Symmetry: C5
Subunit: 280 residues, 5 copies
């Protein structure tokens, strides 16, 4: 599919597919038990801090990771073949209204009397989505190349290189690249969309920092994101696979015990419109 | 009405309907008495907090719920006609009332008990929808362990007849409902379902925090087009038009242990509809 | 005059008129004396607080009210029995809130920023802000809605819900009660914490409003002589001036200053300029 | 030159002129000495406060004033020609200098005298104007009782020859002036007059507060068109072009009694002009 | 040539080049050792403060400087010649997700119990990029003309003028000009894009101040910045050299030792589209 030709016409030349991607904040979907850890699903476990300038060992279940799904498209296939082309996406982050629960057991707004309301989710927020015809290309970049990430259960820079991180990993080191090929495995504090690749994926991201920052979110079923490039060509789905990637961090809740923070994430809906494209 | 055809022309082919939806913050419209609870109408009652990690039992009158109304349209009927909602002018009314800083709220100077009465601040939530059938709802909660009352509110357990599961803290497609009753569906549980709502347009925003300044714009000059990408608006099944909304401005805080009360404001809708031939 | 026809052409068929509306924050324009109360003009008097959950009696001079003016345009119709008549149509307005630069005075005697030493700067105006303007061919239609139906507004000196209904406020007045309606027919009388533009009426008026809350919120304002607000509706028709009367309405609250005595707050308002372009329209 | 006719064509019919206007925050450009006061150039001197409700006497060197320049254009003259200002590229230069947090300002850790030197913060005011005559000014003050110096600043009393009146705290049409001198008209007194300025375009914004983060954008790719609704730009009377501005970024705060100094930045103008036939 | 004619057509008449510029916050890329100073790469060293109103001498490694690169373009070139013209650029700041590391050893959010989270990067932010056919023209302007900048290892106003700064250097002094001709050498608190020059460069900048201000950033591979002027002419590359300039400061991290601040910068990606232009 090097040369892109005419749009395919006729019955079933256009298709629409939908999916939701649940957040991957740290606690896995199982155990389902609401006493055995399932109560943290949708959240991270309590963020654990470095014990010195040289001893930073975050728990896997404290690190939000990328969500991803590979969706199978209808079968297609002569020198001239057909590919599915992603034209547009309607995407929405669902559940912001749930943050209006200020009646729980979080750190209260009046700490003097332990009264007021249960402090709502606040702070650093991170929203990225991508739609592509192959896995999202990732570029590694970390706060601290000395961070001692677990070897098992997360894919980190050392997983790829088979070597410890180097100081260049705190800036742009082109050696430290990966592909988003697994859900709930690639930490978002390590792996970023690679602007030097991703020719066949469109991604859109934003970051707002701070500690008590009010979370902001909009949602509507009326907004379409066009995925066509400058030449009018959308992502082309290699082997009829469509890749969806996202992360939607709303901030942290804070407990009444030593200000322990838990990340909060929300699920993202995708509705992708695709059309068949003649290719050579 | 599966196939959408031409616009109907001629006498009475276009109509306009207006409505206001009052907020449903927790205190019901009655009793009307300003000593017996009526003084809280437009507000929630005092937000009560969980007593432990496993004991979260919010009062029904502390939980803002969706406002909704079903409006009856003029009677109509191989080829039939349906009312098509083309546009809406909608406005949230009464933000100027938040300029009352002369009441008995927590004062701005708590050291001396002086200053002004702290105005409404904090988390804000504005959603409206216009559709030809009830708004489709998707459940999602902060805490699947929350012990909502069984009577007086429609919650996930009302629908499933079973306790919430951990998946209800993310997207669980089992936990769905329709917004078919005013003042019954808590907004901390029920969200517009993006997987459905083919015949409704909804528009929402959330701003969080505790002391966040509330922001609101209002004008009679703004029109929201309801037509989809094919130029087709919501089609009104059985000549019923559904309006849905919630408009939370934040909380007021009292001088007694910082008790918070939600504040909501009413929303005006003016919908323009036209007759559409369907087959 | 309800069927709207062609635009009138010829000498004097288009006019521009200008006006400024001074703010009505609580202190009246008189007395002019800078010792006898005039020093508060442009501001409210010190905001007084409720003494209990059931005793909220704000002073009239602590309540900002709507500014309004009715401008009389040149008479058009010698004979109102003519089949086709003319009306003035408001096409557009250039409007501006003047004097935000004055808020850069941080050398006065407000609560200072260094409270240990009574030093630093005089705290500038901050907090809740409210900006609304309207241009119409009849009075702005108002809808009442209050924080507290129990608020004991004075009977004399302000037009409130009770002024209209002749009865005490009801709990529904804390939400939308369609009984509680009025028209903005007098300057400096209708409190902005009570009376809001009525979206169910105002067919012949355009209004534009915004609110930003909080207590120490930085005030924000833009001003330029290059911005035109179009007043034409979706059908290309502006407000039509009934009996050649043009109605201007506004409120422009910038926040409060805070004194050195028990954190007493005074509302600050600024004046608004209007330059309205009008044209003659044939009607029947 | 009342009636505006065709654009003039031919050699030298279009010209571009550039200028920078330095801020006028209170310390004059001289003395240049970095020990005898010149170290405050680009800043005000320390803001001095009223001593009572009736004694507010600010120092001239504590009051930011309008910057202005009159630029002479190329010589021109029934049908005459005038220079017409078509557009302007304008930019506030030096925001990067606010990234100096290594100085001796009030530190972020006042307990230990550690952290960083607090950067410039607070109230911000940006206005620029381009016209064919002086910017028309309308006076309006916080306090008509303020005792401005008679010499060294142009204030309302300078114009009227009488003390300010209470109406000067709102809009008093008597209190008008023209911006005809650089570094003389305080910005807390004198505002662009929207009832005049038919031959000037002005653009302003204000953001208040005490610790507000300053915000600024800059690019050489943005052009401000100066043409009115009829396609006519400011027409330069007697071939004079007037530039006016003020660009306040906030205050720095010292380690002694929180003394505040205003910070201003310079503004660049590149104006495109064309000759216009007039009669 | 200074007269701009038609666009060149035919084989290889258009080219695309890409580059990343790593931030220059104060610590140089070497030593690479994560114990010998390399751990600060991507950051400044600890900001040192003035000791009096007349003694302000910042360490060079505490001052963020401009990043720049000169890229060589394909060789060109009787009377009419050709030049490379920069048409557009896609540019992105990479790695904001790394600021979601709140598990380190920064000053904690709960200083009573030394708990909560590791305070994320916050405060003053500064983002500028430029693309041009010659070095970015710089105009000097400082907070304090008395600042004792080091004479070695950095280019300051005194480097250029061979004289001490004067009071006019705190406003616009037209004598105090330079060109951005070296990477990691021109402090951003001294040197600003010069709006009186730069006829052959486009620059775009923003500043947000404060001390605890939440950092904000957007990133996408779908945004193109057009570099053509009002006449449809992009920067023309003198001697086939393309100049890229930037700085991307995200704020500071604060340590647990006397609130020491370290600047944080992030790398910027550029993808520039160029076309050949006939000139006379
Ligand atoms: C329990 C513990 O100390 N775990 C730490 C672990 O210890 C190992 C082992 O588990 C121990 O048995 C043994 O003594 O020691 C070994 C190690 O030598 O070691 C880990 C590193 O190797 C971690 O340090 C781990 O500590 C946990 O670390 C995570 C991050 O990775 C979190 O920081 C976690 O903090 C939380 C959490 O779980 O997220 C924060 C949260 O806010 C707390 N919730 C509340 C309401 O306070 C919980 C809470 O303290 C947990 C501790 O596990 O207690 C409960 C719970 O409420 O979740 C108590 C429940 O009664 C229990 N349920 C039942 C049916 O018994 C429940 C359940 O065990 C777990 O949820 C299962 O995962 O735990 O802590 C931090 O504790
Ligand atoms: C009164 C009470 O204790 N109610 C709680 C209820 O108790 C039950 C019963 O009412 C008691 O008599 C008996 O002893 O116990 C049973 C049950 O064991 O139990 C409920 C759960 O089943 C709740 O716990 C309930 O407490 C109330 O809960 C709601 C949330 O659901 C609120 O948190 C409420 O707090 C407020 C409120 O009403 O919203 C907060 C508000 O800020 C307070 N207002 C002020 C000005 O302080 C009020 C206030 O404390 C109420 C308490 O009811 O007192 C007034 C009032 O001001 O509203 C006092 C008036 O004098 C009274 N009017 C008259 C004519 O007597 C008025 C009126 O009764 C009610 O408004 C009618 O609903 O109440 O509390 C929290 O109290
Ligand atoms: C003075 C007083 O107590 N007034 C209250 C009023 O009392 C009535 C009557 O005036 C009294 O003589 C008598 O003893 O009692 C009767 C009835 O009880 O009763 C009212 C209710 O019926 C009010 O409670 C009123 O209090 C005033 O209420 C208003 C709101 O409606 C304000 O809150 C006001 O507070 C301010 C104000 O005037 O806005 C706040 C302001 O920040 C203060 N200014 C300063 C610099 O501190 C002023 C100030 O304290 C006033 C109080 O009147 O004193 C001055 C002034 O500075 O304005 C002092 C001047 O010397 C004086 N001028 C001359 C020439 O003598 C000047 C002048 O009288 C008034 O400005 C004219 O209106 O007053 O208070 C709050 O006081
Ligand atoms: C010094 C003084 O008291 N000045 C006030 C003046 O007093 C007059 C006279 O100077 C006295 O000797 C005599 O006793 O009284 C007469 C008349 O009363 O009276 C004025 C009113 O008429 C003012 O009140 C004046 O006070 C000054 O007012 C301005 C506002 O108009 C400022 O608020 C100023 O405060 C600053 C300032 O200069 O901006 C604030 C600044 O943050 C301070 N800087 C530092 C580093 O602390 C300075 C500083 O305190 C000044 C005071 O003048 O000291 C230096 C300086 O650092 O600038 C010290 C230097 O050593 C000196 N240079 C040399 C070579 O000796 C330098 C220099 O004199 C001046 O800059 C020249 O203008 O002053 O204060 C406030 O002081
Ligand atoms: C160490 C010192 O005092 N340096 C100052 C310097 O002293 C001179 C000379 O270099 C010294 O060796 C000798 O003892 O004394 C002379 C004369 O006094 O003089 C300079 C002026 O010319 C400076 O004042 C210099 O101070 C340093 O200045 C920079 C800014 O220019 C910074 O402010 C720096 O502070 C930091 C920093 O390095 O950025 C702040 C940071 O937050 C701190 N980090 C931590 C985790 O606390 C570090 C830290 O204190 C450094 C001090 O050098 O210690 C380590 C480190 O953690 O980085 C400790 C490590 O064990 C060590 N590595 C090894 C293998 O031993 C490591 C390494 O030496 C350096 O990083 C290499 O550059 O240093 O300070 C401020 O100290």
């Amino acid at each position: 599919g090097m040369e892109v030709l005419d749009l395919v016409t006729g019955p079933d030349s256009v298709t629409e597919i939908e999916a939701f991607l649940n957040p991957r904040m740290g606690q896995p979907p199982t155990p389902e038990s609401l006493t055995e850890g399932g109560q943290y699903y949708g959240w991270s476990r309590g963020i654990n801090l470095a014990t010195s300038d040289t001893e930073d060992s975050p728990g896997n279940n404290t690190l939000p990771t990328w969500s991803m799904a590979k969706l199978q498209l209808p079968m297609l296939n002569c020198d001239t073949l057909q590919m599915w082309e992603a034209v547009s996406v309607k995407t929405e982050v669902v559940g912001s209204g749930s943050l209006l629960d200020v009646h729980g057991f979080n750190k209260p707004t009046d700490t003097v009397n332990t009264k007021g309301i249960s402090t709502p989710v606040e702070g650093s927020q991170y929203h990225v989505f991508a739609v592509g015809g192959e896995p999202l290309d990732l570029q590694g970049l970390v706060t601290d190349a000395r961070t001692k990430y677990k070897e098992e259960g997360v894919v980190t820079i050392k997983t790829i290189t088979k070597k410890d991180m180097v100081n260049k990993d705190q800036v742009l080191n082109p050696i430290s690249k990966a592909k988003l090929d697994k859900d709930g495995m690639y930490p978002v504090e390590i792996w970023h969309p690679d602007p030097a690749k991703n020719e066949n994926t469109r991604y859109f991201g934003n970051y707002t920092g701070g500690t008590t920052t009010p979370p902001v979110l909009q949602f509507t079923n009326t907004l379409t994101t066009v995925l066509l490039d400058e030449n009018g060509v959308g992502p082309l789905c290699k082997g009829e696979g469509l890749y969806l990637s996202c992360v939607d961090i709303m901030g942290w809740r804070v407990t009444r015990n030593y200000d322990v923070h838990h990340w909060r994430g929300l699920p993202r809906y995708f509705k992708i419109t695709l059309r068949k494209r003649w290719v050579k």
